[PDB]
Amino acid sequence: APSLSNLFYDPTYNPGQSTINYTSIYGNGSTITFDELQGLVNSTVTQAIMFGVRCGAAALTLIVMWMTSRSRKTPIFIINQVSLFLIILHSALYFKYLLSNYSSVTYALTGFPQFISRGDVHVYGATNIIQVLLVASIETSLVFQIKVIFTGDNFKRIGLMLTSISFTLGIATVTMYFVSAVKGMIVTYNDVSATQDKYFNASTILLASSINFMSFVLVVKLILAIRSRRFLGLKQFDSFHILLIMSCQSLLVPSIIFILAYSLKPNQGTDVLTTVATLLAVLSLPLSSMWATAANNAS
Amino acid sequence: APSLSNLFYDPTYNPGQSTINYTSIYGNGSTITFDELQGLVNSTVTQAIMFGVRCGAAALTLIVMWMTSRSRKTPIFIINQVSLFLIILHSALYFKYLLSNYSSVTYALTGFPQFISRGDVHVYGATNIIQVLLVASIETSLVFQIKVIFTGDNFKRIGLMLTSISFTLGIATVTMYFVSAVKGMIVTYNDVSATQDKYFNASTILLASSINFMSFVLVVKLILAIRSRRFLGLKQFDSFHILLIMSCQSLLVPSIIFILAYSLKPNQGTDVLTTVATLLAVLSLPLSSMWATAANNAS
Numbered sequence: 001a002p003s004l005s006n007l008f009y010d011p012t013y014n015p016g017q018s019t020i021n022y023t024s025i026y027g028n029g030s031t032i033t034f035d036e037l038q039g040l041v042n043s044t045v046t047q048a049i050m051f052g053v054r055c056g057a058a059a060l061t062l063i064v065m066w067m068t069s070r071s072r073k074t075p076i077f078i079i080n081q082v083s084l085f086l087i088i089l090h091s092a093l094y095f096k097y098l099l100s101n102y103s104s105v106t107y108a109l110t111g112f113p114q115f116i117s118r119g120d121v122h123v124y125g126a127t128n129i130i131q132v133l134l135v136a137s138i139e140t141s142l143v144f145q146i147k148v149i150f151t152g153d154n155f156k157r158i159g160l161m162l163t164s165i166s167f168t169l170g171i172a173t174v175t176m177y178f179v180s181a182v183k184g185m186i187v188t189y190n191d192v193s194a195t196q197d198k199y200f201n202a203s204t205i206l207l208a209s210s211i212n213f214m215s216f217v218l219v220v221k222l223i224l225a226i227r228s229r230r231f232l233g234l235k236q237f238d239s240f241h242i243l244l245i246m247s248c249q250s251l252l253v254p255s256i257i258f259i260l261a262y263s264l265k266p267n268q269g270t271d272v273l274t275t276v277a278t279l280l281a282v283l284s285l286p287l288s289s290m291w292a293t294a295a296n297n298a299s
Numbered sequence: 300a301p302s303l304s305n306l307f308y309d310p311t312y313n314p315g316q317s318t319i320n321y322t323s324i325y326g327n328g329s330t331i332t333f334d335e336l337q338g339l340v341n342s343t344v345t346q347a348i349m350f351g352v353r354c355g356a357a358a359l360t361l362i363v364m365w366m367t368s369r370s371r372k373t374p375i376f377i378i379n380q381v382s383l384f385l386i387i388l389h390s391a392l393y394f395k396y397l398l399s400n401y402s403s404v405t406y407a408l409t410g411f412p413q414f415i416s417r418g419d420v421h422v423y424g425a426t427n428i429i430q431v432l433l434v435a436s437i438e439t440s441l442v443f444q445i446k447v448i449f450t451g452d453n454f455k456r457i458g459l460m461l462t463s464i465s466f467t468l469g470i471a472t473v474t475m476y477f478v479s480a481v482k483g484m485i486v487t488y489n490d491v492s493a494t495q496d497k498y499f500n501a502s503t504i505l506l507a508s509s510i511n512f513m514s515f516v517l518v519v520k521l522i523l524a525i526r527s528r529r530f531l532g533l534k535q536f537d538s539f540h541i542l543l544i545m546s547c548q549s550l551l552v553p554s555i556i557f558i559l560a561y562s563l564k565p566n567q568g569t570d571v572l573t574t575v576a577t578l579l580a581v582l583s584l585p586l587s588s589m590w591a592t593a594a595n596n597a598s
C-alpha cells in the first residue's frame with residue numbers, strides 16, 4: 001500500500017464502469033468495461049453448474065436403476081441404461097472443454113489464433129458426436145416405447161401409423177444433428193476463429209416435436225383406457241390420475257419446457273431452458289416406460 | 300477490422316504474457332498478466348462444478364431414500380433425511396453467492412469497498428450457519444449409529460466408553476465450527492475487505508477424526524462378528540466381506556480421502572479433496588446405518 005487515491009473516499013464512485021486497456025489483433029490500444037468482462041465470466045459460471053447437475057443426477061440414477069429393477073433383459077432397460085452413460089460421458093468431455101484455452105477470457109478479448117493448439121478442436125469435436133449419439137439413443141427409446149403399446153389386436157391399424165410418424169421423425173432428428181455437426185466441424189477445423197452455423201435451431205424443434213408426440217400418444221392412451229375400463233364391469237382410478245399426469249409418466253413437464261424454450265426469445269434464457277429439458281426427458285424416460293408397457297385394463 | 304497488426308503473423312508470439320492496464324485503490328496505473336486473470340476465473344469455474352454435483356446427487360438421493368425404505372419412523376432415517384436437505388440448501392445459497400459482486404473479478408482486481416452492498420455479506424453469512432447445522436446433523440447421526448451397536452448385554456462396558464469418545468468429539472466439532480463462524484462474521488461485518496481467520500483448519504481435522512473413529516468402530520465390529528460366528532456352529536461370509544469393506548458400509552473411502560486431505564499441502568488440492576469427502580460421507584451414511592443396526596450373529 002504505497003498511497004491510497006482519492007477514489008477510496010468517493011461514495012458516488014462506481015467501479016465496473018472503469019476501462020480495461022488491452023492489446024488485440026487490431027493493434028495495441030483496445031478498451032473494454034469491467035461489466036462486459038464480468039458478463040463473459042458469468043456465462044461460463046452459469047453453464048458449469050448445469051453440467052455438474054447433469055453428471056451427478058445421471059451418475060446416481062444409473063446405480064439406482066440397476067439395484068431396483070428386477071427384470072434386466074428387456075431392450076428398453078438397456079437403451080435407458082446407455083442414455084445416462086452418454087450423458088455422463090458428454091458431461092466429462094464438457095468439463096475437460098470448459099477449462100481449456102478455447103473457452104477462456106484471453107481468447108475472447110484477444111482473438112489470437114496462436115493460443116489454440118491442435119487437440120482443443122478435437123475435444124470440441126468429440127462433444128458434438130456424443131450429442132448425436134445421445135439423441136439417437138433417446139429417439140430409439142421413444143420408438144421402442146411406441147412399439148409395445150399397440151401389441152394387442154384392439155387397434156392393429158393405428159399403431160402402424162403412429163410407428164410411421166415416430167420413426168421418420170427420429171431419423172429426421174438424428175440426420176439434422178449429424179449434418180449440423182459435420183458442417184460445424186469442417187468450418188471449425190478449417191479456421192479456428194469462425195462463426196458457428198445455425199439453421200433456425202431446426203434440431204431442437206424436431207426433438208421438441210418428437211417429445212410432444214410422445215406426450216400426445218400417452219395422454220390419448222389414458223383417455224382410451226378410462227373408456228375401456230367403464231364399459232366393462234371394472235373399477236376406475238381415484239388418485240392415480242394425478243400420478244399418470246403430473247408425475248412425468250406422460251412426459252408432460254419435459255414437453256412444456258421445450259415449447260417454452262423454442263418460443264421465447266434468446267434473452268429470456270433459451271440456451272438454459274433446453275439443457276434442463278434434455279436432462280428432464282432423459283430422467284423421465286424410465287417412468288414413461290412403465291406406463292406404456294403396462295396392461296390397459298388388467299387387475 | 301480496421302488494420303491487422305504484425306502480431307497476427309508472428310508464430311512465436313505468446314498471448315497470455317501480455318499486460319492488462321487497470322485502475323485500483325492505489326491509483327491509476329496498475330498492471331497484471333492475462334494468466335493471473337485466467338487463474339482467478341478458473342477457480343470459480345472449478346468450484347461451481349463440485350457444488351452442482353452436490354446439489355444434483357443429494358436432490359436425487361432424497362426421493363430415492365423415501366421411495367425405497369420401508370420403515371420411516373426411526374430417528375436415523377429422519378437425521379439422514381435432513382442432512383441431504385441441508386446439503387441442498389447450502390448448495391442453493393452457494394449458487395446465489397457465486398454470481399454476486401463479492402466473488403467477481405472486478406472486486407478482486409479493484410478492491411473498492413463501494414462495490415459491496417448490504418445483503419452480499421448476509422448471503423455470505425447465512426452459508427456459514429448452514430455449514431454448522433450440516434456438521435451438527437452429521438455428528439448426531441454418528442452418535443445415533445454408535446448407540447444402537449452395543450444395545451445387547453455382550454459388552455455393556457465398552458459401549459459407554461465409545462459413546463463418551465464419540466459424544467465429546469461431536470460437541471467439540473460443532474463448537475469449533477460455531478466459534479469459527481462467529482469470529483469470521485464479526486470481522487467480515489466490521490470491514491468488507493479483511494482476511495478470514497483460520498486455526499490450522501482445526502475443524503476439518505476434528506471432522507476427519509470423528510469419521511476415522513466411526514471407521515475404526517465398524518471394522519472392529521466386523522472382526523468381532525467373525526470370531527462370534529465361528530465358535531458357534533454357524534456359517535460364515537464368502538463374498539460379503541468385500542461388500543462390508545469396499546462398498547462404504549464401513550465409511551472407508553470417506554476416511555481415506557480426509558487423511559489424504561489434511562496431510563497434503565494446499566498446492567495438491569486441499570480445498571478440493573474436502574468438499575468431495577463431505578459429499579461422500581453424507582452419501583455413505585445410509586449404508587453405514589444398515590450395518591450398525593444389523594444383528595451380529597442372526598440368520
Ligand SMILES: CC(C)CCC[C@@H](C)[C@H]1CC[C@H]2[C@@H]3CC=C4C[C@@H](OC(=O)CCC(=O)O)CC[C@]4(C)[C@H]3CC[C@]12C
Binds near residue numbers: 042050272398
Ligand atoms: C431433478 C433433479 C436432478 C434436480 C434438478 C435441479 C435443476 C432443475 C436446477 C438445480 C440448480 C439450478 C441452476 C442454479 C443456478 C442457475 C444460475 C441462473 O443464473 C442467473 O439467472 C443469474 C446469472 C446470469 O444472469 O447469468 C440461471 C439458472 C441456473 C443455471 C439454475 C437452472 C436450474 C438448475 C440446474
Ligand SMILES: CC(C)CCC[C@@H](C)[C@H]1CC[C@H]2[C@@H]3CC=C4C[C@@H](OC(=O)CCC(=O)O)CC[C@]4(C)[C@H]3CC[C@]12C
Binds near residue numbers: 085
Ligand atoms: C461410466 C461411469 C458411470 C462409471 C462406471 C461405473 C461402473 C463401473 C459401475 C456403476 C454401476 C455399477 C453396477 C451397479 C449394480 C450392479 C448390480 C450388482 O448385483 C446386484 O446388486 C444384484 C445381485 C446381488 O444381490 O448380488 C452387481 C454389480 C453391478 C452390476 C454394478 C457393477 C459396476 C457398475 C457398472
Ligand SMILES: CC(C)CCC[C@@H](C)[C@H]1CC[C@H]2[C@@H]3CC=C4C[C@@H](OC(=O)CCC(=O)O)CC[C@]4(C)[C@H]3CC[C@]12C
Binds near residue numbers: 088089092093096119
Ligand atoms: C464416462 C467415464 C468412462 C469417464 C470418461 C472420462 C474421459 C472423458 C476422460 C478421462 C481421461 C481424459 C483424458 C486425460 C488426458 C488427456 C490428455 C490431454 O492432453 C492435452 O493436450 C492437454 C494437457 C496438456 O497440455 O498436456 C487431452 C485430453 C485427454 C486425452 C483427456 C480426454 C478425456 C478423458 C479420456
Ligand SMILES: CC(C)CCC[C@@H](C)[C@H]1CC[C@H]2[C@@H]3CC=C4C[C@@H](OC(=O)CCC(=O)O)CC[C@]4(C)[C@H]3CC[C@]12C
Binds near residue numbers: 059092100
Ligand atoms: C459414476 C461416478 C462414480 C463417476 C465415475 C467416473 C469418474 C471416475 C470420472 C467421470 C468424470 C471425470 C472427470 C472429468 C474431467 C476431469 C478434468 C481433468 O482436468 C484436466 O486435467 C484438464 C483441465 C485442466 O486442468 O486444465 C482432470 C480429470 C477429471 C477431473 C475427470 C476425473 C475422473 C472423472 C470424475
Ligand SMILES: CC(C)CCC[C@@H](C)[C@H]1CC[C@H]2[C@@H]3CC=C4C[C@@H](OC(=O)CCC(=O)O)CC[C@]4(C)[C@H]3CC[C@]12C
Binds near residue numbers: 089118120126
Ligand atoms: C468410455 C468409452 C465409451 C470410450 C470413449 C473414450 C473417449 C472419451 C476417448 C477415447 C479416445 C480419446 C481420444 C484419443 C486421442 C486424442 C488426441 C489428443 O491430441 C492431443 O492434442 C493430445 C496428445 C498430443 O499432444 O499429441 C486429443 C484428445 C483425443 C481426441 C482423445 C479424446 C477422448 C477420446 C475420444
Ligand SMILES: CC(C)CCC[C@@H](C)[C@H]1CC[C@H]2[C@@H]3CC=C4C[C@@H](OC(=O)CCC(=O)O)CC[C@]4(C)[C@H]3CC[C@]12C
Binds near residue numbers: 243246247248362366
Ligand atoms: C414439482 C417440483 C416442485 C418437483 C417435486 C418433486 C418431484 C421430483 C417428485 C414429487 C412426486 C414424485 C413422484 C411420486 C410418485 C412416483 C411413483 C413411483 O412409483 C412407485 O412407487 C410405484 C407406483 C405407485 O406406487 O403407485 C415412481 C416415482 C414417482 C413418479 C415420483 C417421481 C418424483 C416426483 C415427481
Ligand SMILES: CC(C)CCC[C@@H](C)[C@H]1CC[C@H]2[C@@H]3CC=C4C[C@@H](OC(=O)CCC(=O)O)CC[C@]4(C)[C@H]3CC[C@]12C
Binds near residue numbers: 267268269270276
Ligand atoms: C422437476 C423439477 C426439478 C422442475 C423444477 C422447476 C423448473 C422447471 C424451474 C425452477 C427454477 C426455474 C429457473 C429459475 C430462473 C431462471 C432464470 C431466467 O432468466 C431470465 O429470465 C433472464 C436471464 C437469463 O436467462 O439470461 C430464465 C429461466 C430460469 C432458468 C428458470 C427455468 C425453469 C426452472 C429451472
Ligand SMILES: CC(C)CCC[C@@H](C)[C@H]1CC[C@H]2[C@@H]3CC=C4C[C@@H](OC(=O)CCC(=O)O)CC[C@]4(C)[C@H]3CC[C@]12C
Binds near residue numbers: 362
Ligand atoms: C423428472 C423427475 C421426476 C426425476 C426424478 C428422479 C427419477 C429418475 C427417480 C426418482 C424416484 C425414482 C423411482 C423410485 C421408486 C421406484 C419404484 C421401483 O419399484 C420396484 O422396485 C419394483 C420391483 C418389482 O418389479 O417387483 C422401481 C424404480 C422406481 C420407479 C424409481 C425410478 C427412478 C425414479 C423415478
Ligand SMILES: CC(C)CCC[C@@H](C)[C@H]1CC[C@H]2[C@@H]3CC=C4C[C@@H](OC(=O)CCC(=O)O)CC[C@]4(C)[C@H]3CC[C@]12C
Binds near residue numbers: 056095342349571575
Ligand atoms: C458419487 C457420484 C455423486 C459422483 C461424484 C463425482 C465427483 C467425485 C466428480 C465428478 C466431477 C468431478 C470434477 C470435474 C472436474 C474437476 C476439475 C479438475 O481440474 C482442475 O481443476 C485442475 C486445476 C485447474 O486447472 O484449476 C479437478 C477436479 C474436478 C473439480 C473434479 C472433482 C471430482 C468431481 C466433482
Ligand SMILES: CC(C)CCC[C@@H](C)[C@H]1CC[C@H]2[C@@H]3CC=C4C[C@@H](OC(=O)CCC(=O)O)CC[C@]4(C)[C@H]3CC[C@]12C
Binds near residue numbers: 387
Ligand atoms: C427442495 C428439496 C428438499 C426437494 C423437495 C421435494 C419434495 C416436494 C418431494 C421430494 C420427495 C417427495 C416425497 C417422496 C415420497 C413420498 C411417499 C409417497 O407415498 C405414497 O403414497 C407412494 C409410495 C408408496 O406407496 O409408498 C407420498 C409422497 C411422498 C411423501 C413425496 C412428497 C413430496 C416430496 C417430499
Ligand SMILES: CC(C)CCC[C@@H](C)[C@H]1CC[C@H]2[C@@H]3CC=C4C[C@@H](OC(=O)CCC(=O)O)CC[C@]4(C)[C@H]3CC[C@]12C
Binds near residue numbers: 387388392395418422
Ligand atoms: C433449498 C430450498 C428448500 C429453498 C431454496 C430457496 C432459495 C434458493 C431462495 C429463498 C429466499 C431467496 C432470497 C430472497 C431475497 C433475495 C434478495 C434479492 O435482492 C436483494 O438482494 C436486494 C435488492 C438489491 O439487490 O438491491 C436477491 C435474491 C435473494 C437473496 C434471494 C436468493 C434466493 C433465495 C435464498
Ligand SMILES: CC(C)CCC[C@@H](C)[C@H]1CC[C@H]2[C@@H]3CC=C4C[C@@H](OC(=O)CCC(=O)O)CC[C@]4(C)[C@H]3CC[C@]12C
Binds near residue numbers: 358391394395
Ligand atoms: C424440487 C427440487 C428438485 C428442488 C428444486 C430447487 C429449485 C427450485 C431452486 C434450488 C436452487 C435455486 C436457484 C439458486 C440461485 C439462483 C440465482 C438467482 O440469481 C439472481 O438472479 C438473483 C437476483 C438478482 O440479483 O437479480 C436466481 C434464482 C436461482 C437461479 C435459484 C432458482 C431456484 C432454484 C433452482
Ligand SMILES: CC(C)CCC[C@@H](C)[C@H]1CC[C@H]2[C@@H]3CC=C4C[C@@H](OC(=O)CCC(=O)O)CC[C@]4(C)[C@H]3CC[C@]12C
Binds near residue numbers: 417418421422425
Ligand atoms: C426452507 C426453510 C428451511 C427455511 C429457510 C429459508 C431461507 C432460504 C431464508 C430464511 C431467512 C432468509 C434470509 C433473511 C435475510 C436476509 C438478508 C437480506 O439482506 C438484504 O439485502 C435485506 C435488506 C438489508 O438488510 O439491507 C438478504 C437475504 C437474506 C440473507 C435471506 C436469505 C434467505 C433466507 C436464509
Ligand SMILES: CC(C)CCC[C@@H](C)[C@H]1CC[C@H]2[C@@H]3CC=C4C[C@@H](OC(=O)CCC(=O)O)CC[C@]4(C)[C@H]3CC[C@]12C
Binds near residue numbers: 063542546547586
Ligand atoms: C468410479 C469407479 C471406482 C466405480 C464406482 C462404483 C460404485 C459407485 C459402486 C460399485 C459397487 C456399488 C455397491 C454394490 C452393492 C451395494 C449394496 C446395496 O445394498 C444391498 O445389499 C442391496 C442389493 C440389491 O438390492 O440387489 C447398496 C448399494 C451398494 C453399497 C453399492 C453402492 C455403489 C457401489 C459402491
Ligand SMILES: CC(C)CCC[C@@H](C)[C@H]1CC[C@H]2[C@@H]3CC=C4C[C@@H](OC(=O)CCC(=O)O)CC[C@]4(C)[C@H]3CC[C@]12C
Binds near residue numbers: 556566567571572575
Ligand atoms: C468412490 C467413487 C465415487 C469414486 C471416487 C473417486 C474420487 C475419490 C477421485 C476420482 C477423481 C479424483 C480427482 C482427479 C483429479 C484431481 C486433481 C488433482 O490436482 C492436482 O494434483 C494439482 C492441481 C490442483 O491443484 O488442482 C488433485 C486431486 C483430484 C481433485 C482428484 C481427487 C480424488 C478424485 C475426486
Ligand SMILES: CC(C)CCC[C@@H](C)[C@H]1CC[C@H]2[C@@H]3CC=C4C[C@@H](OC(=O)CCC(=O)O)CC[C@]4(C)[C@H]3CC[C@]12C
Binds near residue numbers: 060063360369579585
Ligand atoms: C458413491 C457411493 C457413496 C454411493 C452413492 C449413491 C448411494 C447414496 C445410493 C446408490 C445405491 C443406493 C442403494 C440401492 C439399493 C438399496 C437397497 C434397498 O433395499 C430395500 O430395503 C428395498 C428393497 C430392495 O430394493 O432390495 C434400500 C436402499 C439401498 C441400500 C440404496 C441406498 C442408497 C444407495 C447406496
